């Protein structure tokens, strides 16, 4: 769902009048993404535990089943019913493979 | 079970049960108020004949009690 | 006729708590689940205006 | 969850027995650190400090030096962080 | 005090570390290495080299002073809840309480009337023992323990009793 | 209803050919909720309708007019102003009202043609441009508030930019 | 600009019924006459460059 | 049908027994009240006068409501104090607020300004015996000399002003008359016939500078909290620049401009001071002070749109200001100081009337549509037409409408307490009812606020 | 306000004097506090205790105003300048923008069609 919200932006935005410098700034963010998003995984959840405290209960709760299982129905199809279903204006993806089209999948990677 | 903290909450809840009595009280004017507009006819749009320009109520669309 | 009688439905289902609120009824512990419930079906009543919309 | 009287001297043996400089046959919970114990002036910083991790940290500078047995220093952090009723 | 100063300046290095190391084993390696830049110095005592070292302390300290020091949980000052999660209620709310409301649960009203007339006749005497405290001005530094063991109350009663609960 | 202009007509009629599915979800919600409470509420009205039976005509509006302009009568006195500054008055809270209507026909339009906006209409576009530039001279907009006495010198000041630029070309 | 294959994408959206998402000979003809306009506009920015070089000899 | 009942309440109360007394006061003041909500709000095109000129029509003043809701609440406030002392004294100070609400009327109704002058000065006599007296602090004198010399020294020369008019323009009277003003000529001896009409709803109406009359009457509180309330119909009794700027003096407003300037600076500076003081009274006394000015902005632009959030603001403040008042009353009743520092506690020891608290607060803020957003924003709107820079300076000040509100609810919203042992019951019925009485009347003026501002609406 | 170095800790010597200095200011902190204590822990009071530094607090910005202002100088001067100036300042900003609109409703016409608001 981040191909259907974040990269439609990146591709539209290359092929404009408007500012360069604003445009260049963009990108740098579009791959700095990958940082923060990984110090939640690999900083705290990821490796060995750094034990908060001496006997710690964490236990799944009923109420808490109910409420993520039926948020990754929303968190998954939104690329599926929101994108195709509203009606668009204007398609911006025909020119630059490599410089603009594939910059904006590249930026996560790198 | 645990003692937990207090509250007033006698002063508190008491104030909210003397509010609403009275609020009640002059709640069956309001529930006449629906069937005045069920029961009696409000008003119609028609051309007025030259005989009474006021009688009762001069001028009043809409509404029994505004008669 | 249908899409202007729907729409404000959700208005009224968000707002039937807080008439609640104020008295009226007693309910202890469920104030909480009457919250839930009365969304729940918000979504209901949301989901089918949207689809109009796309026809 | 709640924390019991009994439970929480039994969790502050259970650390200083395995500090490795201090002997676990020596002291036990009556002895205290000042003068049974062989602690150094540091050393008692350092061992409260650890203390504090397992638990719920809470250690004032100024109450740091009154707290010097295990004894004392298990009630001081009950009375603290309210425990046993 | 020289020996005070020395140990709250090692309090705060100890939990200031942990915010630059981010793993349990690499921090028990840094700590090793903190204890034996302070021994050299500890073993003789001076009264102007021991000082010129506690001043030289505050710097390098200065230099890596703020990564966003952790606090962990409840903390005086900080971050995260420092007086929330905690609202509580006062003790003269208690006694403050309506009749009706009040005869609800009999066992804790009976009990705390009891504690009550116990600390109204208590008051007397503290009074007269908090002034026998040899000073002649008013106070000196603290509160003064009990001498009495018949009479009990070392001077404060409200002060441990009816405090606060989570 | 005969004030309002509006669009004449609405097509709004569904094919329906792609696609078997199951049939459509806003055809069969639109056919069973008509039954299920809007026929109900459509008997309740009509119930309630025809339990009113007697209803009394009134004359609503008041007629009024005219009674001597505010522009043919002059000199400070008592009985011939006061009949002069409530048809002023009477004309000034008219003409409040009949901007808001020209205001709603163009309400009308942006709503009814969405994609055009702009394009098409026109007809609307000119009658606000019109009636709003002629509320801007002469009834006040401009000079202070509300006043039929000030209203005639308001009216003085258009009628001798008239006769000043006319007279040079 | 396209007008013509952009009327068919409406048409398929006009009776598009619950499961709209399989629409994909409609959605073909956006990106075929758009890439073209594309293009049509890289040859006007194409043939200012070349021109600018012609220019430049005399 | 409005005066001679508002009259029989001073035998009403020497008449009646010992015992009851307030019973009677309240009772019977609210049912003369609802009847005054019954005939004033007809009108046609152009409201027409009543009778003869003794008390007139209302045109322009759904404020006359406003003075009958507070006819019975400077009585709810006033049961906590008065009790302590004698009897024959707690009739005395009931009458002088019937005294008050019997020349509060009458500069109302009354369509005059010849007349009208003996009733706005006719306001300050009753006031001044209710501030001199009953005050718990000092410096009751240095309040009370301040009440008069400000205001007299402002309102004489309408006596040189307004004869002035009359002996050589026909007749002021039932300003339905005064259609033969003709416009003033602009000249050096017309400047102090402007400046005398002005300068006595200049001191009333508080500015930036002679503004020091309101905070001395507030600070030094007269009887508990409910003659504070008559302190706000005070501000709003000097309406009659209303009158005077549209009738007396159209083609002026060239002298105007001047005193705009000076009003505008009475936003910002009279905003900064009011944050960093200790009393809470005063926190309200200063920002009383910016909420009227906005009035004073609306009026010399003489635009229609801006009397309309003109009329609006002086019912607005008029139940707002006096709503956080009352509050500040049952901290005053309570800790026995007005020190905002020392009186810190609520929803732990008052949790009912800390939501009492947060809805009077709000409503100084631009909240959902009740009064204050019909009020504020409207002036806003029409200071724009005047001139373009007015909302860089105008938006500064609703940034720190906020800072009145919230400066005193985060004050009193720390539970702690630990000084304070007293306030154990946390409101009594009758103080509860006192809350409601203010907000709840202001929230009925959501559904048709026709009736909060009509200068031809 | 704050200098190349925070104070916190810097620039401490224990000394002679600053062992007495310190004896000084717990000597006034203790007597302060036990008239607290005998005004806290007893049932019989029930109400809000006065304390005399609070009350004086209050009354320096309430009181004390015609006291002072006696040595005016160019302090004062300067204060003026800084509240009766402000006011001088937009004379020249509010009228100049005014003059500029004044000159296009005669001539060369700004103002929208579409406007009749106020």
């Not at chain 8, 009646?16 to 006061?25: A, D, T, Y």
């Not at chain 8, 009383?288 to 229609?304: D, E, F, G, K, W």
């Amino acid at each position: 769902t981040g191909f259907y919200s974040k990269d439609l932006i990146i591709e539209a935005a290359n092929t404009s009048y408007t500012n360069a410098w604003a445009l260049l700034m963009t990108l740098i963010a579009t791959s700095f993404t990958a940082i923060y998003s990984t110090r939640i995984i690999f900083f705290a959840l990821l490796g060995q535990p750094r034990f908060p405290t001496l006997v710690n209960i964490n236990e799944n709760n009923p109420l808490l089943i109910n409420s993520i299982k039926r948020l990754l129905i929303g968190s998954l199809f939104a690329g599926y019913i929101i994108s195709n279903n509203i009606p668009p204006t204007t398609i911006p993806q025909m020119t630059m493979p490599y410089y603009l089209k594939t910059t904006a999948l590249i930026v996560t990677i790198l | 079970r645990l003692f937990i903290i207090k509250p007033s909450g006698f002063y508190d809840k008491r104030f909210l049960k003397l509010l609403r009595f009275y609020i009640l009280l002059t709640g069956i004017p309001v529930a006449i108020g629906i069937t005045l507009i069920n029961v009696x006819x409000x008003x119609x749009x028609x051309x007025x004949x030259x005989x009474x320009x006021x009688x009762x109520x001069x001028x009043x669309x809409x509404x029994x009690x505004x008669x | 006729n249908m899409f202007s009688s729907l729409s404000l439905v959700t208005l009224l289902l968000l707002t039937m708590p807080i008439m609640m609120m104020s008295f009226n009824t007693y309910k202890p512990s469920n104030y909480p689940l009457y919250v839930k419930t009365a969304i729940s079906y918000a979504f209901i009543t949301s989901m089918i205006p949207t689809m109009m919309f796309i026809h | 969850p709640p924390l019991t009287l009994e439970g929480i001297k039994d969790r502050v043996l259970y650390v200083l027995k395995l500090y490795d400089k201090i002997d676990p046959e020596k002291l036990s919970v009556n002895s205290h650190f000042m003068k049974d114990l062989g602690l150094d002036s540091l050393d008692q910083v350092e061992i409260i400090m650890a203390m504090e991790d397992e638990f719920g940290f809470e250690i004032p500078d100024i109450d740091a030096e009154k707290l010097m047995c295990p004894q004392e220093i298990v009630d001081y952090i009950a009375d603290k962080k309210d425990v046993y009723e | 005090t020289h020996q005070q100063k020395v140990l709250r300046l090692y309090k705060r290095a100890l939990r200031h570390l942990e915010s630059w190391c981010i793993h349990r084993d690499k921090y028990r390696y840094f700590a090793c290495l903190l204890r034996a830049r302070f021994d050299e110095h500890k073993n003789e005592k001076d009264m102007v080299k021991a000082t010129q070292l506690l001043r030289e302390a505050e710097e390098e300290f200065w230099h890596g002073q703020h990564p966003q020091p952790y606090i962990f949980p409840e903390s005086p000052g900080g971050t995260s809840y420092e007086r929330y999660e905690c609202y509580k209620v006062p003790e003269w709310c208690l006694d403050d309480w309506h009749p009706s409301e009040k005869a609800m649960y009999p066992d804790y009203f009976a009990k705390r009337e009891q504690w009550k007339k116990l600390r109204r006749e208590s008051w007397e005497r503290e009074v007269x023992x908090x002034x026998x405290x040899x000073x002649x001005x008013x106070x000196x530094x603290x509160x003064x323990x009990x001498x009495x063991x018949x009479x009990x109350x070392x001077x404060x009663x409200x002060x441990x009793x009816x405090x606060x609960x989570x | 209803x005969x004030x309002x202009x509006x669009x004449x007509x609405x097509x709004x009629x569904x094919x329906x050919x792609x696609x078997x599915x199951x049939x459509x979800x806003x055809x069969x919600x639109x056919x069973x909720x008509x039954x299920x409470x809007x026929x109900x509420x459509x008997x309740x009205x009509x119930x309630x309708x025809x339990x009113x039976x007697x209803x009394x005509x009134x004359x609503x509006x008041x007629x009024x007019x005219x009674x001597x302009x505010x522009x043919x009568c002059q000199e400070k006195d008592v009985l011939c102003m006061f009949e002069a500054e409530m048809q002023w008055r009477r004309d000034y809270k008219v003409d409040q009202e009949i901007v808001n209507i020209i205001q709603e026909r163009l309400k009308a339009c942006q709503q009814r043609e969405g994609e055009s906006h702009r394009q098409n209409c026109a007809k609307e576009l000119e009658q606000f441009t019109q009636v709003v530039k002629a509320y801007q001279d002469r009834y006040x907009x401009x000079x202070x508030x509300x006043x039929x006495x000030x209203x005639x010198x308001x009216x003085x000041x258009x009628x001798x930019x008239x006769x000043x630029x006319x007279x040079x070309x | 600009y396209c007008a013509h294959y952009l009327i068919r994408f409406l048409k398929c959206k006009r009776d598009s019924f619950p499961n709209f998402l399989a629409c994909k000979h409609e959605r073909h003809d956006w990106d075929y006459c758009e890439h073209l306009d594309y293009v049509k506009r890289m040859k006007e920015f194409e043939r200012e460059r070349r021109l600018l070089q012609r220019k430049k000899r005399r | 049908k409005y005066i001679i009942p508002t009259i029989m309440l001073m035998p009403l109360t020497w008449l009646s027994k010992n015992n009851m007394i307030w019973v009677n006061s309240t009772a019977h003041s609210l049912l003369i009240s609802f009847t005054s909500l019954l005939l004033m709000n007809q009108f046609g095109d152009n409201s027409l006068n009543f009778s003869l000129l003794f008390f007139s029509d209302s045109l322009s003043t759904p404020l006359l409501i406003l003075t009958m809701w507070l006819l019975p609440l400077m009585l709810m406030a006033s049961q906590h104090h008065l009790s302590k002392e004698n009897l024959t004294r707690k009739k005395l100070f009931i009458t002088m607020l019937i005294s008050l609400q019997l020349f509060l009327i009458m500069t109302f109704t009354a369509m005059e300004l010849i007349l009208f002058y003996i009733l706005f000065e006719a306001t300050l006599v009753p006031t001044l015996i209710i501030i001199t007296r009953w005050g718990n602090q000092t410096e009751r004198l240095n309040a009370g000399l301040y009440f008069l010399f400000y205001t007299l020294a402002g309102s004489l020369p309408l006596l040189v002003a307004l004869i002035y008019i009359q002996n050589t323009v026909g007749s002021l009277n039932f300003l339905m008359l005064q259609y033969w003003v003709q416009p003033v000529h602009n000249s050096w001896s017309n400047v102090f016939m402007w400046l005398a009409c002005m300068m006595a709803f200049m001191v009333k109406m508080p500015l930036y500078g002679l503004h020091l009359w309101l905070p001395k009457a507030h600070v030094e509180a007269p009887i508990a909290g409910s003659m504070v309330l008559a302190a706000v119909l005070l501000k709003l009794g000097g309406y009659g620049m209303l009158r005077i700027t549209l009738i007396l003096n159209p083609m002026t407003d060239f002298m105007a401009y001047p005193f705009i300037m000076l009003s505008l600076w009475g936003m910002i500076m009279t905003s900064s001071i009011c944050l960093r003081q200790t009393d809470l009274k005063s926190l309200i006394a200063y920002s009383s002070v910016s909420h009227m000015a906005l009035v004073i902005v609306a009026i010399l632009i003489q635009t229609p749109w801006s009397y309309m959030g003109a009329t609006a603001l002086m019912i607005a403040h008029g139940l707002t200001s006096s709503m956080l008042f009352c509050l500040a009353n049952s901290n005053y009743e309570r800790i026995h100081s007005r020190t905002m520092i020392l009186a810190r506690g609520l929803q732990t020891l008052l949790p009912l009337m800390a939501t009492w608290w947060l809805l009077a607060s709000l409503t100084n803020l631009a909240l959902p549509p009740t009064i204050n957003l019909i009020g504020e924003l409207f002036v806003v709107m029409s200071t724009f037409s005047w001139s373009n820079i007015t909302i860089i300076l105008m938006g500064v000040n609703m940034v720190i409408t906020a800072l009145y509100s919230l400066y005193m609810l985060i004050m009193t919203q720390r539970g702690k307490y630990t000084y304070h042992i007293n306030n154990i019951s946390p409101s009594f019925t009758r103080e509860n009812a006192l809350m409601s009485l203010h907000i709840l009347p202001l929230l009925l003026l959501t559904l048709n606020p026709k009736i909060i501002l009509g200068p031809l609406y | 306000x704050x200098x190349x170095x925070x104070x916190x800790x810097x620039x401490x010597x224990x000394x002679x004097x600053x062992x007495x200095x310190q004896a000084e200011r717990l000597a006034i902190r203790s007597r302060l506090k036990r008239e607290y204590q005998l005004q806290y822990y007893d049932p019989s009071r029930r109400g809000v205790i006065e304390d005399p530094a609070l009350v004086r607090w209050t009354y320096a910005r309430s009181a004390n105003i015609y006291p002072n202002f006696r040595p005016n100088t160019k302090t004062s001067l300067l204060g003026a300048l800084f509240g009766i100036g402000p006011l001088v300042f937009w004379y020249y900003v509010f009228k100049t923008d005014r003059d500029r609109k004044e000159k296009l409703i005669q001539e060369g016409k700004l103002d929208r069609t579409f406007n009749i608001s106020y």
